[PDB]
RNA sequence: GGAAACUCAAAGAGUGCUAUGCGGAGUGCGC
């Protein structure tokens, strides 16, 4: 019975607790009956996690009853004896037997990682990179291992380095879901703008623009292309016309919903140059994979492509008198659309004339280009 | 510094999931290779 | 010495390190041939330290293509890059335990900094692992073995012969 | 061709006699409603609503497992619960019969190496759930460990010249300890030069070097010449 | 060191230090190499324009109570420990 | 590896021609298609020997399935009219099968022809 | 005299079951 040990383990700390005036020995052996039916019902057989979490809450409760003690009958902040160590670091150990033992639920992961997070005061990085690398080894398809652990360790340390290797590990590992390339491109523009302002801050004291972006954008496009037409047809590859071409087109659609996500919330970002990158990105759209979706089918999404290319340049506000300078571009633009068009000529001629009134004495000549519009 | 304040986050589901609650419910309560045999 | 092992399943790949080191000379004996059957004492010799399952039921039947033609793929390539630590110059080579001889050498091109053993104590753990399987993973996973390779055998046996499909 | 024949359960579980003039072999079978092969089957009435339930018969002149049984076997490997690698597995002649031994729980792993009788083996494979088909070649197991498990009998019906070889290293790769394992032996595609029960001393002391232990063996006389089936157990631990 | 090892109670037996290497980690690229495609493209981006950590040293050359707190949140990983380093040398020579 | 995989060569081509004429004029043989998977599921077949020149090919290419199943060796030859002179009769033959015998004269030869065309395949 | 159980007592076998090991740093060395 290796209960007897963990129970002979923790003696000194009250030993020590009790000949110094805290606590009296009529309650810490109630204390260490509590101690014993856990410890039992933990390393029994059959135990769960809410034995181990249980088991920690009534641990951290003697902590802080320990604290509130400590600083009424003694009045200091701490007696600097082994208790005060101790019982925090027999919480991590019975977090340490709780994640060897159960390492499947990540809300036992998860607060043993809130837990050292808040203890980070005073532990170390050193602790947390352990349990993340081996937390990551044991879930590599779980996404949100690595979009946690590089929030942390980019919102605290902010190790740009370590957080560009987990993100190309995470991507690595599966390149196959939209979110992690989602939010890689989202650490890419955030470090990416923090450096262009920390270099005007330097301006102010005293190349880099979103070519990265588009490079994973491009990878993120052709691998999700990849992963999608493989998650499909599942076991053979199907040989036909249309299941051929529904599956192709198929995934052009999921693919370009995906990029209408990328141009929607990549316009959050204005401190760069959203319009060049949304143009390279509808630029990198034109050119398609064995379906082309301008000229022949997926005509909706030719039409709200179409649309997505005017308003890329006609992102304005309500005070538009740049507008009214630059919409000329807008107006050509409209014209050499509508002269290709057939029926997405009348789709995206009420389009922009809902945008415009979506724009809608400076409103005297706005009210002549509307009627212009109209 | 109110742009770098305003900045979009990386998004989890993490200390939501250490920290949200249980709410639901709990409801209450031949072989094989075996001839019939005549 | 043989630090590490990977283990090739249906769902996916599997990495377990090894805490305690089988016995060398008496491996041939009834008593320690009965360890590996005991799973209570089976687990005192391996640990799981990783699993990266499959994404899709098609990198399933591309992985077992790329096994039984003895070739590296990128996940596996992955998993052993995620696990396995870099050594120093020469001095403690770093050790995998997998299950044939050819897929030894090119995973040995792959990775210079990790040796690569079969011998009668591999394939004795290995097959140990093979025996215990789903029960030394304790639910980390997304698939159940028997019927996975039933999918897979399938797919692996119509691709292999070309069965036609009009 | 249409007369009435009585039921009755066999020594091993899972295989049945039908008792009727003359008396055929039968099992349960899992696809009602079909013959795979050409064999014959006797359809019986279980009467709750009443089913209709059907026994495939096994030919011992077309399966060498069918000829070890009606020849006496004092015990197989192959139980209703088990699973079975069957190594050399040609088409739905004997392994349908194997499968439906075993059962809707348990698998049977079939291999083979040809292409034809590998495709027809996945059509019928289609048919019925428990079986696993394998198109490769049995002399390298490791490009099949990938997919299958563990298995607690092999059945090795395999005709070439490396038998010992080929059951060694299939399990030591796959088979459990304390396992069974059953052999076809053919003495004439072994070696024709030298005689039957020299060539069968020869590969029961291969196995036994192999520390399969043989409890037992049988000529299968009256239905096939110079086979032999060799029953023994993977002791893998304490031969003696 | 033979005296010093009879007199020893127990002798947990390799006792030559086991050069264990460094164990692997998520956390740092362990070829040095491009692995990827994407790893590829990333770096031949990045090494025309990056840091090694010169810009950083440059923008921790610093000296309000709000222009040290936008400087401290547009510090940078090496930079900041390198700045704690020198504020803990700072402190430990000012202070007592 | 077009369809018809087990070309015999010249010199096998031969041998396994004059085995057959000694097997025909033994009446120790059977010839023809059906008469070949005929006394080929009967299982009275030593290995059959197929024409790899017929009109088409299909016709005697089901012979394979069955006998790779039972575990009889076939060995295809590039001419109808060459197997049909050997077969010691009129018209041209396609397939051909030796029926096993123990009374057999030929038995030796039969055994080495089958030992080299195993080993080709 | 034969038969119901959550009637109890005593043995046996099988299936399971994990059966399950001063501190943040800083300061010079350890490749």
Redesign the pocket.
């Given at each position: 019975?290796?209960t007897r040990?963990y129970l002979e383990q923790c003696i000194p700390e009250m030993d020590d607790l009790v000949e110094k005036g805290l606590f009296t020995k009529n309650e810490v052996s109630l204390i260490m009956k509590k101690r014993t039916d856990f410890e039992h019902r933990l390393?029994?057989?059959?135990?769960s996690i809410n034995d181990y979490i249980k088991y920690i809450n009534y641990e951290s409760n003697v902590n802080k009853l320990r604290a509130k003690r400590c600083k009424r009958i003694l009045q200091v902040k701490k007696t600097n004896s082994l208790s005060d160590?101790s019982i925090q670091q027999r919480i991590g150990f019975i977090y340490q037997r709780g994640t060897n033992?159960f390492p499947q639920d990540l809300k036992f992961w998860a607060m043993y990682l809130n837990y050292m997070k808040a203890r980070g005061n005073?532990?170390?990085?050193?602790?947390i990179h352990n349990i993340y690398n081996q937390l990551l080894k044991l879930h590599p398809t779980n996404v949100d291992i690595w979009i946690s652990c590089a929030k942390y360790e980019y919102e605290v340390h902010a190790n740009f380095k370590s957080c560009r290797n987990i993100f190309q590990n995470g991507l690595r590992f599966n390149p196959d879901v939209p979110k992690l390339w989602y939010e890689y491109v989202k650490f890419e523009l955030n470090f990416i703008t923090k450096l262009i302002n920390r270099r005007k801050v330097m301006g102010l004291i005293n190349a880099l623009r979103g070519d990265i972006a588009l490079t994973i954008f491009d990878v993120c496009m052709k691998t999700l292309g990849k992963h999608y037409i493989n998650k499909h047809k599942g076991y053979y590859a199907i040989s036909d016309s249309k299941m051929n071409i529904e599956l192709n087109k198929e995934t052009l659609n999921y693919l370009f919903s995906e990029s209408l996500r990328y141009i929607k919330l990549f316009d959050e970002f204005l401190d760069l140059e959203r319009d060049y990158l949304i143009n390279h990105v509808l630029q990198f759209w034109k050119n398609d994979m064995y379906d082309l979706s301008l000229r022949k089918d997926l005509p909706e999404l030719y039409l709200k492509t179409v649309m997505i290319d005017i308003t890329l340049n006609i992102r304005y506000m309500p005070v538009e008198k740049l507008d009214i300078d630059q919409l000329q571009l807008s107006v050509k633009k409209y014209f050499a659309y509508i002269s290709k068009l057939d029926s997405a000529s009348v789709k995206s001629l009420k389009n922009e004339y809902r945008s415009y009134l979506q724009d809608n004495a400076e409103d005297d000549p706005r009210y002549k280009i509307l009627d212009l519009i109209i | 510094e109110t742009n770098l304040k305003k900045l979009p986050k990386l998004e989890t589901g993490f200390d939501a999931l250490a920290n949200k609650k249980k709410k639901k419910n709990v409801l209450p309560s031949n072989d094989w290779f075996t001839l019939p045999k005549p | 010495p043989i630090e590490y092992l990977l283990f090739e399943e249906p769902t996916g790949y599997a990495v377990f390190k090894v805490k305690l080191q089988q016995d060398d000379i008496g491996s041939r004996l009834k008593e320690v041939q009965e360890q590996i059957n005991?799973?209570?004492?089976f687990?005192?010799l391996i640990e799981l330290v990783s699993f990266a399952p499959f994404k899709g039921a098609a990198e399933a039947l591309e992985n077992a293509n790329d096994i039984s033609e003895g070739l590296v793929s990128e996940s596996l390539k992955a998993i052993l890059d995620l696990n396995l630590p870099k050594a120093?110059?020469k001095?403690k080579n770093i050790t995998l335990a997998i299950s044939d001889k050819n897929l030894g050498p090119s995973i040995k091109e792959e990775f210079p900094y990790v040796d690569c053993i079969s011998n009668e104590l591999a394939q004795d753990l290995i097959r140990g692992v093979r025996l215990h399987g789903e029960?030394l993973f304790?639910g980390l996973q997304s698939g159940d073995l028997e019927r996975a390779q039933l999918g897979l055998g399938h797919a692996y046996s119509r691709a292999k012969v070309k069965f036609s499909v009009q | 061709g249409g007369a009435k024949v009585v039921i009755e359960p066999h020594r091993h579980a899972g295989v049945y006699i039908a008792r009727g003039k003359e008396d055929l072999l039968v099992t349960k079978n899992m696809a009602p409603g079909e013959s795979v092969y050409g064999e014959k089957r006797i359809s019986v009435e279980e009467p709750v609503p009443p089913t209709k339930v059907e026994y495939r018969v096994w030919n011992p002149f077309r399966s060498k497992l069918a000829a070890g049984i009606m020849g006496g076997l004092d015990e197989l490997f192959i139980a209703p619960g088990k699973k079975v690698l069957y190594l050399g597995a040609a088409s739905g002649t004997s392994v349908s019969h194997v499968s439906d031994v075993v059962g809707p729980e348990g698998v049977v792993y079939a291999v083979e190496f040809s292409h034809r009788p590998g495709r027809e083996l996945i059509s019928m494979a289609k048919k019925r759930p428990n079986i696993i088909p394998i198109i490769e070649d049995a002399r390298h197991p490791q490009k099949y460990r990938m997919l299958i498990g563990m298995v607690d009998c092999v059945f090795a019906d395999v005709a070439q010249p490396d038998q010992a070889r080929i059951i060694a290293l299939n399990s030591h790769m796959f088979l459990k300890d304390q396992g069974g394992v059953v052999i076809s032996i053919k003495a004439n595609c072994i070696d024709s030069t030298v005689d039957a029960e020299t060539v069968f001393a020869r590969e029961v002391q291969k196995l036994r070097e192999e520390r399969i232990k043989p409890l037992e063996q049988l000529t299968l006389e009256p239905y096939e010449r110079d086979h032999c089936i060799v029953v023994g157990r993977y002791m893998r631990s304490g031969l003696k | 060191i033979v005296q010093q090892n009879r007199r020893a109670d127990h002798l947990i037996f390799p006792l030559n230090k086991p050069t264990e290497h460094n164990h692997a980690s998520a956390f740092t690229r362990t070829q040095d190499v491009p692995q990827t495609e994407l790893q590829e493209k990333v770096d031949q981006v990045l090494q025309e324009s990056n840091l090694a950590n010169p810009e950083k040293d440059s923008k921790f050359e610093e000296l309000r109570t709000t222009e040290m707190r936008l400087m401290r949140e547009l510090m940078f990983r090496e930079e900041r420990?390198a700045r704690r380093?020198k504020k803990?040398?700072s402190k430990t020579y000012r202070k007592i | 590896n077009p369809k018809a995989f087990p070309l015999a060569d010249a010199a096998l081509t031969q041998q396994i021609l004059d085995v057959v004429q000694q097997a025909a004029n033994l009446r120790q043989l059977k010839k023809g298609a059906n008469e070949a998977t005929k006394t080929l599921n009967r299982g009275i077949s030593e290995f059959i020997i197929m024409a790899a020149d017929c009109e088409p090919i299909e016709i005697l290419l089901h012979l394979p399935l069955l006998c790779e199943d039972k575990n009889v060796p076939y060995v295809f030859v590039p001419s109808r009219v060459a197997l049909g002179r050997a077969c010691g009769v009129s018209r041209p033959v396609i397939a051909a099968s030796i029926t096993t015998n123990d009374a057999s004269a030929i038995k030796t030869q039969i055994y080495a022809v089958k030992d080299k065309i195993e080993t080709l395949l």
């Open positions: 019975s290796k040990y390393n029994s057989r059959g135990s160590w033992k005073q532990t170390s990085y050193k602790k | - | 005991d799973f209570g004492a687990t005192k120093s110059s001095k029960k304790k | - | 420990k380093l803990i040398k | -």
